[PDB]
Model the fold of this input.
Amino acid sequence: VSQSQRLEHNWNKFFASFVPNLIKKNPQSKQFDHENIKQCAKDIVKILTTKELKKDSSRAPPDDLTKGKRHKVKEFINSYMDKIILKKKQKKA
Done:
């Protein structure tokens, strides 16, 4: 069956609602290199659902960014971005 795999598609829709417009031109993107941004956007969409669906495999994607979830995705994405910047800066230290 693997209903959760289909849920990723729906989950993607939810994350795609805010993830792109948050990064595309924010304090993040002005520091975010191009490949960083493309990777962050697509991977935060999948990885967040994959991981939280790994928490709860029947976790249906919430409609939109509720205050609680919004706070969490912002903290997640912040550390995510830090992860890419720190790695690339390490090459140009």
The CA atoms of residues 10 and 88 lie 32 Å apart. The chain has one domain: 1-93. Helices lie at 3-24, 34-55, 67-89. The radius of gyration is 14 Å.
